[PDB]
Ligand binder design. Structure first.
Ligand SMILES: O=C(NCCCNc1nc(Nc2cccc(NC(=O)N3CCCC3)c2)ncc1I)c1cccs1
Ligand SMILES: O=C(NCCCNc1nc(Nc2cccc(NC(=O)N3CCCC3)c2)ncc1I)c1cccs1
Lengths: 308, 308
């Protein structure tokens, strides 16, 4: 079967994404046949407080930029009367899928990496200008679109965890994805250690740092022997124990000691010149200590210098 | 983009399911065009030991039954040379999708619930006859198919956590979904409290009990104010602190006390006669005490008695 709103229709088997609060479907405008991605909230999502439910709607109605997936319409699905989000369809899918390809085992080609850099920075700048935090940035929700000239353009999506947050404002609520998650959030959300901490916009810089390391090398920067998901204790030791300036930490052997590095791997796909410029960016955003990590002004200045 | 094996092909946008280790695509046999669901493992999945990776393949090769989604072929995808699983496509989707429908907000119609009962029992019996434990049973991986006579037939799938395990064998590894997870496993996997416990095949009985409660009432049996995922500590209190005989525990108000019940809610969609037969079944499988919990045989005997 299918579901529909006044103007749009989607088959329930035409899935594009699956999540805690919502699924995304490939759907069509009824009259034109034009394709869209339609985000449809599940029952359990309505247990959230109303102001929380409204955030993604308010956030997306505020944004408009080439590095953010476009929102076309908000309409009401008929059987539930719930609002759905009707968004630009990106037929190429995500950066996650690009990174899975064998040719990218040791990182993206430098040309493609520089594009990811440009576009993630551009998206993040647009959010910050508009006082928005994302809180779940990762390759799985950075979408690839083929631009006018045949080259990639990447765009941020999945604003399910996003909110308006003034430049110095803090929050205590938990969102995100374990492999990409700032250590202070990981501490509470994954290890359940409550150390009475607050979090700020800079959580997005940590996830971007992890995303860039991943795009640059083909691997996540912080890796217990079993992978992050399967050894939460060691994952936490890697991310909280890392020396200042380190950008990666790996446990090579089961139950083994941890090795951290402040440089890119020897296998890194990027030119050595770029590696040398990238490494300080990563070191200063993969920095848990709020006293030492970069602010946004600087992150944008320092990456915009690399792009030129 | 598409991926293919010798005999089958799928578009990467044609998704049917997404998970930690794999995605499932709607694909086709290249020559006949016949439709299949194709399970394809992601890169991070290969961090698992090889014997663990092989389990799902070995398990599915053993099974052949009306209440198990059929395995058609194992073939190699070309770009990675990884084996994929080529399965029966069920165009109707899952029991989870059925349960989202507003008409089922207070539980399935009795005629449908009885079908779910017959079929989950039939699938679970087939697994036990073959020495298999599933370890992630929930509505999301119970698929609905329309039988010859127009009536539903449900079938188990997603054997990503499954293994061979005799009644007299135990394990310490962790799998499952928090809302459906046996308390001993929840304690370690979700709360990360380690009490040197070992788990057995009867973990599938707990998930089945939660699944049946959900199908009978339209709601999960164990429910903090914010939902299970948004308040794990209270969830643990609920599932471990319930009296013997209790089949549900609900926190009504934010930070409120917990309402335990050994009976179905007054809103239950099932006839009262069926309710009274169902409740002792749920009471004796939603029981962590292994000295008290039913085994599979007694569970199949008592559910068979309801069906006839
Ligand atoms: O937004 C989310 N996730 C981001 C993706 C879904 N959204 C969109 N998707 C596309 N096109 C597209 C094309 C090919 C493949 C895909 N999907 C995948 O490749 N997957 C999904 C599961 C496994 C790998 C998507 N266009 C626009 C959007 I907006 C959310 C998931 C759950 C809540 S939000
Ligand atoms: O097996 C899994 N999951 C079970 C489902 C995927 N498998 C199959 N699906 C179908 N048909 C089908 C039809 C309509 C919709 C759907 N999907 C959904 O409705 N979704 C998926 C995302 C949210 C809701 C599936 N037939 C056969 C199979 I095998 C796994 C997911 C990740 C690893 S394994």
């Amino acid at each position: 079967g299918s579901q529909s709103t006044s103007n749009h229709l989607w088959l329930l088997s035409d899935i594009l994404g699956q999540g805690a609060t919502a699924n995304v479907f490939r759907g069509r405008h009824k009259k034109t046949g034009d394709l869209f991605a339609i985000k449809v909230f599940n029952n359990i999502s309505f247990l959230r407080p109303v102001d929380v439910q409204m955030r993604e709607f308010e956030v997306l109605k505020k944004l408009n930029h080439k590095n953010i997936v476009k929102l076309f319409a908000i309409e009401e699905e008929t059987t539930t009367r719930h609002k759905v989000l009707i968004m630009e369809f990106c037929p190429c899918g995500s950066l996650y899928t690009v990174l899975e390809e064998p040719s990218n085992a040791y990182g993206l080609p430098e040309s493609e990496f520089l594009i990811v850099l440009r576009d993630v920075v551009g998206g993040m700048n647009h959010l910050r200008e508009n006082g928005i935090v994302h809180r779940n940035i990762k390759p799985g929700n950075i979408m690839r679109v083929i631009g006018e000239d045949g080259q990639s353009v990447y765009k941020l999506t999945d604003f399910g965890a996003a909110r308006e947050l003034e430049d110095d404002e803090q929050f205590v609520s938990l969102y995100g994805t374990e492999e990409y998650l700032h250590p202070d959030m990981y501490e509470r959300a994954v290890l359940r250690k409550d150390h009475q901490k607050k979090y700020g916009a800079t959580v997005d810089l940590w996830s971007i740092g992890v995303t860039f390391y991943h795009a640059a090398t083909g691997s996540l920067p912080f890796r217990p022997f079993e992978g992050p998901r399967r050894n939460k204790e060691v994952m936490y030791k890697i991310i909280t124990g890392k020396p200042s300036g380190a950008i990666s930490g790996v446990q090579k052997a089961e139950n083994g000691p941890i090795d951290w590095s402040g440089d890119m791997p020897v296998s890194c796909s990027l030119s050595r010149g770029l590696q040398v410029l990238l490494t300080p960016v990563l070191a200063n955003i993969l920095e848990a200590d709020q006293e030492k990590c970069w602010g946004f002004d600087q992150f944008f200045a320092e990456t915009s210098d690399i792009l030129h």
